[PDB]
Design a protein around this ligand. Structure first.
Ligand SMILES: Cc1cc2nc3c(=O)[nH]c(=O)nc-3n(C[C@H](O)[C@H](O)[C@H](O)COP(=O)(O)OP(=O)(O)OC[C@H]3O[C@@H](n4cnc5c(N)ncnc54)[C@H](O)[C@@H]3O)c2cc1C
Ligand SMILES: Cc1cc2nc3c(=O)[nH]c(=O)nc-3n(C[C@H](O)[C@H](O)[C@H](O)COP(=O)(O)OP(=O)(O)OC[C@H]3O[C@@H](n4cnc5c(N)ncnc54)[C@H](O)[C@@H]3O)c2cc1C
Ligand SMILES: NC(=O)c1ccc[n+]([C@@H]2O[C@H](COP(=O)([O-])OP(=O)(O)OC[C@H]3O[C@@H](n4cnc5c(N)ncnc54)[C@H](OP(=O)(O)O)[C@@H]3O)[C@@H](O)[C@H]2O)c1
Ligand SMILES: NC(=O)c1ccc[n+]([C@@H]2O[C@H](COP(=O)([O-])OP(=O)(O)OC[C@H]3O[C@@H](n4cnc5c(N)ncnc54)[C@H](OP(=O)(O)O)[C@@H]3O)[C@@H](O)[C@H]2O)c1
Ligand SMILES: [Hg+2]
Ligand SMILES: [Hg+2]
Lengths: 467, 467
C-alpha cells in the first residue's frame, strides 16, 4: 500500500491556499508553515482593504462633486476614519476566518505550523516556531509561496523616519491633512487617490511619469484625472533627503522643500526569499531574488516548486492562486502549465485602468506587426450620458490577420469591460468579428465595439449602434 | 448604364438611420420620410434622456445614503430639476444634430421629407407634408421603420386625465411630490426608481409581480431593492378608475384609494402601423399590428422590408440598428440575416438587470435539457467590498455538453459583465472553460467565474481565486 505524498507549503496567501487545498484533493498530506497572520497579503494588507478604502473614497468624492452639480447640491462630508477603519477591518477579519483559517483548520489532512521556515536540505525544512524552539518538516515535495514585501529606496533619512508602506497606510486610523507619496504605479496611485478623496492634500513624487512602464496614454489620462481633482503630481521628481522634524516630514526634492504629515513609500515589492536558505536545497534565484520557475512552477530542484509574488510572476492574487493550483497538480504527479496570454489587470483608480494582452510596444518587442485604434471616451454613449469623458479605449491587432491581441482602457468600469476583451483574445477573434457582435447601448463595454469599428470606418459618421 | 436603386425609408430612428446610411454606401438613392422630430425614440424620448436621468438619480441617491454612512456623513441634496432637465435636453439636442440631422443633411444621395407616409401601392407612398399638401414617393424598395408608441390601457377615466407616458415624464421640469406608476417592466421600473431617487414618493401598481415575463429571481431581487429604498410596490394590484380632482390623481384600486400628483402609465408599446395603409402594398401584420418579417427583414411584399419596434423584434436600439443595416443590404441585392442568439439586454435600475441567451424556462419551452446555478452576490468579492450584496448571478447550461446557454444577473454593473457572458455563449464555451479563464479579483464580472465554478465544487470551500 502506498503512502500519502508529504507536501510542505511555505506561506498561507493565495498561492499557498490554492496549493494546499488542491494537494489534499489529490490525496496528499499537507504541512503548511506561516510566520505571520494567516492569509498573507490579499486578504490582510492588500487587495481587500485597499478596494474597501477606495470604495469609501468614491462615495466621499461623489458627495463632494459630480457632473450633475448644476442640479444636485453637494456638501463636503465629514469623515470618521475610525468608523471606516473598523468596518474595513471587520470584513478583512471575516474573510480571513471564512476563506483561510476555517478552511485550513477544518481539514484533518492539513497541519498548520506557526513559524518561519527555511530549507535544511532538498527534502526538509527547519522551522523557527513563533512560540520558540524549532521543528523539522520532512517533505516529498515543497511549494515555496512566500510572497513579497514593500521595497524601500535608500533615500538618506528615510530608513529611520516613521514612514508608511501600503500596510501602515491601510491600517491608519486617521486621514492625514497632508500626504506625500513616493512612487508612481498601482500601489502609489490607488492609495494616493483614496486618501485625497477622504480628505488629504496629496502630493505624488513620480521619478518619471505615471505608469512609466505602460502605454503612455494610460499615464497621460490618469495624470490629468488626478490633477483635475486637486492631487499634485510632480513628474521627474525625486526626494534626495527625508527628515522628520517638529512632528512632520520634510522632503528635500528637485522641486524644492515639501512638508507632509505622513509619507507613503510605494516603490515596488521585493520577493521574500533571503530567509529561506535556498542554496541549501539547490533552488536558484534571479538578480532580483525571485525564485526561478518554469510554466509548471518547477524550480531548479525537481522536488521544489514556487508560485506567486516570490517568483517573477505578475503580482495579482488570481495569478498566485492559479499558479498554486497548478504547482499542486505537478507536486502530485500531474502535468499542468500556467497560461497568462489572456491575463487581465485592473488599477482601481477613478477612472480605472485595465489592460489585457499586448500593448503596441510589447507586440513590437516580440516581433509582431500591429495596427491600433484609440477611441476617446467622448465617443462612448455611456460616458456622454454620465457627462464624464475622461479616458479612452485602445485596441491592438495583429496586421494581416486582424486578430485582437491587446486592449488598454482608462475608463470608469474599465475592470468590467476588460473581461470581454480578455475572452475575445482567448477565442482569437478579429476586430471585425468583435464589432459584429451585439453590445448593449449605453454601457461602457459598448466602447469596445465602437473602437473595433474604427478599424473599418469613421465612428463619427456611423449612426446609432450601426453594426 | 444602370440607375441607382430608389430606396424609400419611413422613419428616422435607429433602424431607419442605419438603413439609410448602408443603402447609400451600397450605391442607392434614399428618400427618408419622418413625420416628427428627426431621430425617433432612442435619442429624443427614450434611451438617452432616460439613462441621463437615471445617472442623476444615482448621484442623488448616493448623496442621501450608502453602505459607508457609519463613517461618511450624508445629506439630503436639494434638487433643481429645471437645471437637470436643461442639461439632459442639451445632450439630447447635441446628439440629434451630430448623429442624425448632420449625417442626413450632409449626404446628397439622401432627401429628407418632413411628413407622414402611407402606402399608395407596392411601389409608391403618399406623404402628407407637415407644411401641407402631399407628394408621391416612388420607390424600388422601401423600408418601414416606424417604431412604436406607448400603450394605454382602457381604464375608466384614464384617457381624458393629464397622465404621463415615458415621454412626458422625461420632459417634466419638476419632480412630483407623489408619483403613481401603472406598469411593472423596464420603462415603469427604470423611471420609478429615478423619480424616487430624485425626491418623489413613488407607488408602483403592478398587475402581477415585477418582471413577470422574466426568471422570477429577477423580480424578487428588484422588488426587495425597491422596497429597501422606500418605493412602494403593490403587487397584484390594478386601478379600476382614474380621476383627476382638486389638482391630483385619485386612483381606485384593489388596495384602496391612492392619490398622487402625477401618474406614469408604462404598460408596453404598440407598433406604429395603423396610418400606413399596409393593405395597399400587400404587407401583412400580426394580431398586435406588428409587421411580419423573416430573418432578412422581408415582409409579405418582396420589395418592402421592415425593421425595429414596428416589427415583433426586441425593442432595443442596437437591435433596430442591426436590423436596419441588414434590411438595406437585402434591399440592395445582398443576402443578410439577423442573429439574436447572443443578444444582451440591460435594465438600468440599481442594481441593474442583465440577461443574455436562455432562462431555464425558455430553454425548457424549446426542448433543451438544462442545469443551472444561482450565485448570490454575498459570494462575490466586489459586492462584499462594497457592503452591498443585493442580487445574484445565474448561469444556465445545456445538460451533457455543459455549454453555457444563458445568464441572468441582478447586480450593480450587470450590464457590463453580461457582455462577457454574451461572448462566452457566442463562442460556445462550456462553464468549465469559462471558469478556467483568469478574471480580475474584486470586479463584478469575477462573479461569472465564481458562478461557473459552482457546477463542479462548493465556492464556499474554495480558496481565493482558485482556478
Ligand atoms: C496594497 C496592495 C493592493 C493590492 N491589490 C490587488 C488587487 O486589487 N488585485 C489583485 O489581484 N492583487 C492585488 N495585490 C496583490 C496581491 O495581494 C498579491 O499578488 C497576492 O496576495 C500574492 O499572493 P502570494 O500567495 O504570492 O503571497 P502572500 O499573500 O504575500 O503570502 C505569502 C505569505 O508567506 C509568509 N511567509 C513568507 N516567508 C515565510 C517563511 N520563511 N516562513 C513562513 N511563512 C512565510 C508571509 O508571512 C505571507 O503570509 C495587491 C497588493 C498590495 C500590496
Ligand atoms: C423610455 C424608453 C427607454 C429606452 N431605453 C433603451 C435603452 O436603454 N437601450 C436600448 O437599447 N433601447 C431602449 N429603448 C428602446 C429604443 O428606444 C427603441 O427600441 C428604438 O429607439 C427603436 O428604434 P426604431 O428605429 O425601431 O424606431 P423609432 O426610433 O421609434 O423611430 C420611428 C420613427 O418613425 C416615425 N414615423 C412613424 N410613423 C411614420 C409615418 N407614417 N411617416 C413618417 N414617419 C413616421 C416616428 O415619428 C419616429 O421618429 C427605450 C425606449 C423607451 C421608450
Ligand atoms: N490592482 C492591483 O491588481 C494591484 C494593486 C496593488 C498592487 N499590485 C501589484 O503589486 C506590485 C507592487 O506595486 P507597486 O505599485 O508598489 O510597484 P510596481 O508596479 O512594481 O512599480 C514600481 C514603482 O516604484 C517606482 N520606483 C522604484 N524605485 C524607485 C525609487 N528609487 N524612487 C522613486 N520611485 C521608484 C517606479 O517608478 P518608475 O515606474 O518611474 O520606475 C514605479 O512607480 C505590482 O506588481 C502591482 O501590480 C496590484
Ligand atoms: N433598458 C432598455 O433596454 C429599455 C428601456 C426602456 C424600454 N425598453 C423596451 O421598450 C419596450 C416597452 O417597455 P415597457 O416596460 O413599456 O413594456 P414591456 O416590457 O412590454 O412590459 C409590459 C408591461 O405592461 C404591463 N401591462 C400591460 N397591460 C397592462 C394593463 N392593462 N394594466 C397594468 N399593467 C399592464 C405588463 O404587466 P405584466 O408583465 O404583469 O403583464 C408589463 O409590466 C420593451 O420592449 C422594453 O424592453 C428597453
Ligand atoms: Hg445606438
Ligand atoms: Hg481571489
Amino acid at each position: 500500500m502506498e503512502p500519502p505524498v508529504q507536501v510542505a507549503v511555505i506561506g498561507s496567501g493565495g498561492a499557498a491556499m490554492a496549493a494546499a487545498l488542491k494537494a489534499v484533493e489529490q490525496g496528499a498530506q499537507v504541512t503548511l508553515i506561516e510566520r505571520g497572520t494567516i492569509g498573507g497579503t490579499a486578504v490582510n494588507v492588500g487587495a481587500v482593504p485597499s478596494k474597501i478604502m477606495i470604495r469609501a473614497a468614491h462615495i466621499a468624492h461623489l458627495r463632494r462633486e459630480s457632473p450633475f452639480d448644476g442640479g444636485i447640491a453637494a456638501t463636503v462630508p465629514t469623515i470618521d476614519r475610525s468608523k471606516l477603519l473598523a468596518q474595513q477591518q471587520a470584513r478583512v477579519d471575516e474573510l480571513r476566518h471564512a476563506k483561510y483559517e476555517g478552511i485550513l483548520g477544518g481539514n484533518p489532512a492539513i497541519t498548520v505550523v506557526h513559524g518561519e521556515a527555511r530549507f535544511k536540505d532538498d527534502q526538509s525544512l527547519t522551522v523557527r516556531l513563533n512560540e520558540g524552539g524549532e521543528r523539522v518538516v520532512m517533505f516529498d515535495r515543497c511549494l515555496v509561496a512566500t510572497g513579497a514585501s514593500p521595497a524601500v529606496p535608500p533615500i538618506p533619512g528615510l530608513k529611520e523616519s516613521p514612514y508608511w508602506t501600503s500596510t501602515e497606510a491601510l491600517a491608519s486610523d486617521t486621514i492625514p491633512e497632508r500626504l506625500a507619496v513616493i512612487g508612481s504605479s498601482v500601489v502609489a496611485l490607488e492609495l494616493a487617490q483614496a486618501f485625497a478623496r477622504l480628505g488629504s492634500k496629496v502630493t505624488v513624487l513620480a521619478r518619471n511619469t505615471l505608469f512609466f512602464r505602460e502605454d503612455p496614454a494610460i499615464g497621460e489620462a490618469v495624470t490629468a484625472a488626478f490633477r483635475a481633482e486637486g492631487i499634485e503630481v510632480l513628474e521627474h521628481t525625486q526626494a534626495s533627503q527625508v527628515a522628520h522634524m517638529d512632528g512632520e516630514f520634510v522632503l528635500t526634492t528637485t522641486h524644492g522643500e515639501l512638508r507632509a504629515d505622513k509619507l507613503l513609500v510605494a516603490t515596488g515589492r521585493t520577493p521574500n526569499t533571503r530567509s529561506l536558505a535556498l542554496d541549501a536545497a539547490g533552488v536558484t534565484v534571479n538578480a532580483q531574488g525571485a525564485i526561478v520557475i518554469d510554466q509548471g512552477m518547477r524550480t531548479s530542484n525537481p522536488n521544489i516548486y514556487a508560485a506567486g509574488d516570490c517568483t517573477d510572476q505578475p503580482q495579482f492574487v488570481y495569478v498566485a492562486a492559479a499558479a498554486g493550483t497548478r504547482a499542486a497538480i505537478n507536486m502530485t504527479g500531474g502535468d499542468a502549465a500556467l497560461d497568462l496570454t489572456a491575463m487581465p489587470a485592473v488599477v482601481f483608480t477613478d477612472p480605472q485602468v485595465a489592460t489585457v494582452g499586448y500593448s503596441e510596444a510589447e507586440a513590437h518587442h516580440d516581433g509582431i506587426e500591429t495596427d491600433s485604434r484609440t477611441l476617446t471616451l467622448d465617443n462612448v454613449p455611456r460616458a456622454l450620458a454620465n457627462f464624464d469623458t475622461r479616458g479612452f479605449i485602445k485596441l491592438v491587432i495583429e496586421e494581416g490577420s486582424h486578430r485582437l491581441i491587446g486592449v488598454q482602457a482608462v475608463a470608469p468600469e474599465a475592470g468590467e469591460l476588460i473581461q470581454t476583451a480578455a475572452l475575445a483574445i482567448r477565442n482569437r477573434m478579429t476586430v471585425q468579428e468583435l464589432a459584429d457582435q451585439l453590445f448593449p447601448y449605453l454601457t461602457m463595454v459598448e466602447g469596445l465595439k465602437l473602437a473595433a469599428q474604427t478599424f473599418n470606418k469613421d465612428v463619427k459618421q456611423l449612426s446609432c449602434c450601426a453594426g
